[PDB]
Design a protein around this nucleic acid. Structure first.
Ligand SMILES: [Mg+2]
Ligand SMILES: [Mg+2]
Ligand SMILES: [Mg+2]
Ligand SMILES: [Mg+2]
Ligand SMILES: [Mg+2]
Ligand SMILES: [Mg+2]
Ligand SMILES: [Mg+2]
Ligand SMILES: [Mg+2]
Ligand SMILES: [Mg+2]
Ligand SMILES: [Mg+2]
Ligand SMILES: [Mg+2]
Ligand SMILES: [Mg+2]
Ligand SMILES: [Mg+2]
Ligand SMILES: [Mg+2]
Ligand SMILES: [Mg+2]
Ligand SMILES: [Mg+2]
Ligand SMILES: [Mg+2]
Ligand SMILES: [Mg+2]
Ligand SMILES: [Zn+2]
Lengths: 192, 126, 136, 133, 37, 23
RNA sequence: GCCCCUAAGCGUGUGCUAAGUGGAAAAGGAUGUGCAGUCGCGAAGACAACCAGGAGGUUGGCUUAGAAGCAGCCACCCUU
C-alpha cells in the first residue's frame, strides 16, 4: 500500500482577509493554510479545479506535493470547508507531513454484497479514525455483507484493515447494523 | 462488448483455427434457432459450428495465410471448423443447406487454399 | 401528527427567517435525503402527508428518518375579531426550516424508487427542495 | 399448432382443452381416445401434448416426456411446490432420481450429455425450492 | 384533448413536441393527446 | 388588486432607486 | 437621460434575446437557445435506419375457474 504524492501548484497569498478570500474564490482559486509540526504557518492559494480533481480521484485524505515557489512540500488534506448550498470548497487546511510519520485520519467505510433478502442494512458510521503512516493511508475501507441473518451487528473491531494501520477508536463503535426488514404495517407507526 | 473482449475473441478464433484441418464459410440468413440447434446436434459430436463478426475474424485471419478469405466476409458469416477429420462438416453443411434451402455456401479453405462452391462440392465427393 | 408533549411557554414569538442553516445540513442516517432551499415554517401535517407519501411509494422495505420536529407553536385569534385584547390561542405547530437543512432521510435498496418516493415527498412541501446523497 | 398439459388417464375436461381445441379445427373424440390409450400405456404421469394441424383438419399429436416439474414432485414425494422457494424447503432429492430424470429429459431435450439435463433438472428444482443432493 | 398546465408522456409511445409555441403531447392512443394551456 | 400592484411595482424605477412613499 | 414628441449618441467593440421578453406574478410543466464542465459508447464501425434470427427444459413452482414469460406470490436456473 504505497501512494504517490499529487502535484499541485500553490501561491503565497499577498493579502489575507474576507475581501481577498472572496476575490480569490471568484478567480477560480481556493484559499488554504499550510501548517504542521514545524511551527510555521503559510497562507496559500490553490487552483480550485485541480484540487477538486485530486479529491475526486483520491478521496478527502489525499497526500499532496506542493510547489511553493520552487520548493516541494509534502502535505495532507487535514480539513475542508464546503458550502452547504453551493457545495464549493471555501478553504483548505493542509498538514505538514514527512515520510515515515504516523498520523490520525478519518477514513470512510463503504459496504457491498447482498444480505438475506428479508433484511435491511443500515450504516451508522460514515467514517472511522485510524493511526497510519503518512504515505500509507488507505483510500477507503470496505465491509462485505452476505448471508447475514436477522439482527447482526458489525462493530469497529470486526472491520478488516490493511497491514501497518492501527485502529484507534474503541471497537464498540457500531458501524453497520443488519435488521429484519420492516413490514408493510411497520412503516405506519414511526413518525405518527 | 469491450475491445478487450474483441481481442480475446480474436485470440480464441485464431487458436481454434490453428487446430482445424479445414474450414467452411457459409451463409445462414433465414434460419431459426431450432435449425441451428439441430445443426449443432449433428456437428457438435465431431466438428464445430460458429458464427462470428466479419472484421473480428478478419483480424483473426491475419495470423496465417487465410488472409485471402476476407472477400468471403461480405455478408453473413458462418464458420465450420473440422476438429475431427476434414470433410464431415462439409457433408453436414451441404445436407443442411439442401434440406433447409436458406443456406448459401460461400466457400471453403483446405490445403492452404480458398475454394469456391463447385470446388467444395467436388472436394466433399472425395 | 407530531406534537410536543409539553412546552415551557405556550405563546411565543415567530421563529425568525434570517440566515441559512448551520446544523443538520448533511445526510447522516439514511442513504438519500431531502435538502431544503427556502426559508419556511413547515407544519406537522405537511410532515405527516410527506411521510405517508414516502411510505406508500416504498411499501415494505427501507426506513424513513424525520430530522425535523414541529415544536414551535403559532396562534390565531378567533374569527371575526377586532384588533386587541391579547394574544390568541395556539393551534398549529411548525418547525423553522432554513436553506441547507436536511428534512427527510430514506434508506432503500434501489436508486430509482428511492428518488421517486423522495420526489413524491417534495411535491407535498411549501419549499424548493433537492435530493442529496451521502457522497460528497 | 398449440400445446397443452393434460392428465394422463382423463379426457374431455371442460375448462382446459374443450373450447381450446374447438376453435383450432381439431376433432376431439378421436384425439381423446388415442391419447387415453397412449397415456394408459404410460399410466404414470400427466403429460404435455403438442397439436399440429393441417389444411384438411387433420391433427397430429406429439406426446413429450413427463414434465420436469411433475417428475421432480413425484420423485421428491411432495404434492405441491413450495410457496416460498429458497426460503422454505419442503423436500430433498438425491442424485439418482436426478439422473433418471436427466435421462428422460435427454430423451426430451437438446442437451448433448446427461450431465447437462441433470443441471437443467437441478435448476427446475431450484425454481421449486427443493434441495438437490 | 387534455388542456393542462402540466403535460407529461403518460406512456412510452407519447412524444413531447412544440407547435406554434405550445408544448404538446402526441401519441397513437387518442387519450394521451394533451396540450399546455 | 391591480392598482396596489401597479403602484408597488412602479416603486422599482431607475429614478426612484427602489423606494417610493407609501411603498 | 441622448430615434421623434423632447435639450443632448437612429455612439463605438464583443456576445445574447424571437418572447414586443424588454413594457406585472406562484407552485409546477417543457427535445427554446448560448456558454462551461463531467461520465458512457464509438472506424477495433458508434446511435438511427435496416434484412434475418430471439429456441429447448417449460405452462419453473404456490395461487386459483384460470396462471401457459405477461391477478398475485416465491424462487428466478440449464443446454445449443
Ligand atoms: Mg432578532
Ligand atoms: Mg447549532
Ligand atoms: Mg449536522
Ligand atoms: Mg414544492
Ligand atoms: Mg396532472
Ligand atoms: Mg388578491
Ligand atoms: Mg412597507
Ligand atoms: Mg409633450
Ligand atoms: Mg433633439
Ligand atoms: Mg448608452
Ligand atoms: Mg446604428
Ligand atoms: Mg446603438
Ligand atoms: Mg451589436
Ligand atoms: Mg410586456
Ligand atoms: Mg413568470
Ligand atoms: Mg420543475
Ligand atoms: Mg438551458
Ligand atoms: Mg398468475
Ligand atoms: Zn401515449
Amino acid at each position: 500500500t504505497a501512494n504517490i504524492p499529487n502535484k499541485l501548484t500553490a501561491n503565497v497569498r499577498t493579502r489575507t482577509g474576507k475581501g481577498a478570500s472572496r476575490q480569490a474564490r471568484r478567480d477560480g482559486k481556493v484559499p488554504a493554510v499550510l501548517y504542521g509540526h514545524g511551527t510555521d504557518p503559510q497562507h496559500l492559494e490553490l487552483n480550485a479545479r485541480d484540487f477538486a480533481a485530486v479529491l475526486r480521484s483520491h478521496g478527502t485524505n489525499a497526500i499532496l506535493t506542493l510547489d511553493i515557489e520552487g520548493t516541494e512540500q509534502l502535505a495532507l488534506t487535514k480539513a475542508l470547508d464546503v458550502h452547504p448550498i453551493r457545495r464549493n470548497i471555501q478553504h483548505a487546511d493542509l498538514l505538514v507531513v514527512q515520510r515515515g510519520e504516523k498520523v490520525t485520519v478519518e477514513v470512510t467505510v463503504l459496504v457491498e454484497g447482498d444480505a438475506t433478502p428479508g433484511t435491511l442494512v443500515t450504516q451508522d458510521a460514515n467514517t472511522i479514525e485510524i493511526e497510519a503512516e503518512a504515505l500509507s493511508i488507505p483510500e477507503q475501507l470496505t465491509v462485505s455483507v452476505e448471508g447475514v441473518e436477522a439482527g447482526t451487528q458489525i462493530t469497529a473491531g470486526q472491520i478488516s484493515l490493511p497491514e501497518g494501520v492501527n485502529l484507534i477508536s474503541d471497537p464498540e463503535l457500531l458501524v453497520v447494523n443488519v435488521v429484519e426488514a420492516p413490514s408493510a404495517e411497520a412503516l405506519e407507526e414511526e413518525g405518527a | 462488448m469491450a475491445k478487450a473482449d474483441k481481442a480475446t475473441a480474436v485470440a480464441d478464433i485464431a487458436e481454434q483455427f490453428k487446430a482445424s484441418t479445414a474450414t467452411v464459410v457459409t451463409e445462414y440468413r433465414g434460419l431459426t434457432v431450432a435449425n441451428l440447434a439441430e445443426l449443432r446436434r449433428a456437428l457438435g459430436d465431431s466438428a464445430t459450428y460458429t458464427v462470428a463478426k466479419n472484421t473480428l475474424v478478419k483480424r483473426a485471419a491475419s495470423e496465417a495465410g487465410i488472409e485471402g478469405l476476407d472477400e468471403l466476409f461480405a455478408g453473413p458469416t458462418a464458420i465450420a471448423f473440422v476438429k475431427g477429420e476434414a470433410v464431415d462438416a462439409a457433408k453436414a453443411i451441404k445436407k443442411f443447406a439442401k434440406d433447409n434451402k436458406a443456406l448459401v455456401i460461400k466457400g471453403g479453405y483446405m490445403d492452404g487454399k480458398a475454394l469456391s462452391v463447385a470446388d467444395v462440392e467436388k472436394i466433399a465427393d472425395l | 401528527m407530531l406534537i410536543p408533549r409539553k412546552v415551557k411557554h405556550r405563546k411565543q414569538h415567530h421563529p425568525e427567517q434570517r440566515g441559512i442553516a448551520s446544523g443538520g445540513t448533511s445526510v447522516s442516517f439514511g442513504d438519500y435525503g431531502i435538502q431544503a432551499l427556502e426559508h419556511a415554517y413547515i407544519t406537522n401535517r405537511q410532515i405527516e402527508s410527506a411521510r405517508i407519501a414516502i411510505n406508500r411509494h416504498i411499501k415494505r422495505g427501507g426506513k424513513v428518518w424525520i430530522n425535523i420536529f414541529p415544536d414551535r407553536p403559532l396562534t390565531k385569534k378567533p374569527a371575526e375579531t377586532r384588533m386587541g385584547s391579547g394574544k390568541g390561542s395556539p393551534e398549529w405547530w411548525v418547525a423553522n426550516v432554513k436553506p441547507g437543512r436536511v428534512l427527510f432521510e430514506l434508506s432503500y435498496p434501489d436508486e430509482k424508487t428511492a428518488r421517486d418516493a423522495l420526489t413524491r415527498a417534495i411535491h407535498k412541501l411549501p419549499i424548493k427542495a433537492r435530493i442529496v446523497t451521502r457522497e460528497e | 399448432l398449440i400445446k397443452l398439459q393434460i392428465q394422463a388417464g382423463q379426457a374431455n375436461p371442460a375448462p382446459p382443452v374443450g373450447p381450446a381445441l374447438g376453435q383450432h379445427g381439431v376433432n376431439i373424440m378421436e384425439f381423446c381416445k388415442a391419447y387415453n390409450a397412449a397415456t394408459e400405456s404410460q399410466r404414470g404421469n400427466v403429460i404435455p401434448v403438442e397439436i399440429t394441424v393441417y389444411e384438411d383438419r387433420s391433427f397430429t399429436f406429439a406426446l413429450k416426456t413427463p414434465p420436469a416439474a411433475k417428475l421432480l414432485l413425484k420423485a421428491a414425494g411432495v404434492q405441491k411446490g413450495s410457496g416460498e422457494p429458497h426460503k422454505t424447503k419442503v423436500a430433498k432429492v438425491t442424485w439418482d432420481q436426478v439422473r433418471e430424470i436427466a435421462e428422460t429429459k435427454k430423451a426430451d431435450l437438446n442437451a448433448n450429455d446427461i450431465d447437462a439435463a441433470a443441471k437443467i433438472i437441478a435448476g427446475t428444482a431450484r425454481s421449486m425450492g427443493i434441495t438437490v443432493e | 384533448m387534455k388542456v393542462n398546465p402540466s403535460v407529461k408522456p403518460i406512456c412510452d409511445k407519447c412524444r413531447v413536441i412544440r407547435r406554434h409555441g405550445r408544448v404538446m403531447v402526441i401519441c397513437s392512443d387518442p387519450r394521451h393527446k394533451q396540450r399546455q394551456g | 388588486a391591480k392598482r396596489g400592484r401597479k403602484k408597488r411595482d412602479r416603486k422599482h424605477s431607475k429614478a426612484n432607486h427602489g423606494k417610493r412613499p407609501n411603498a
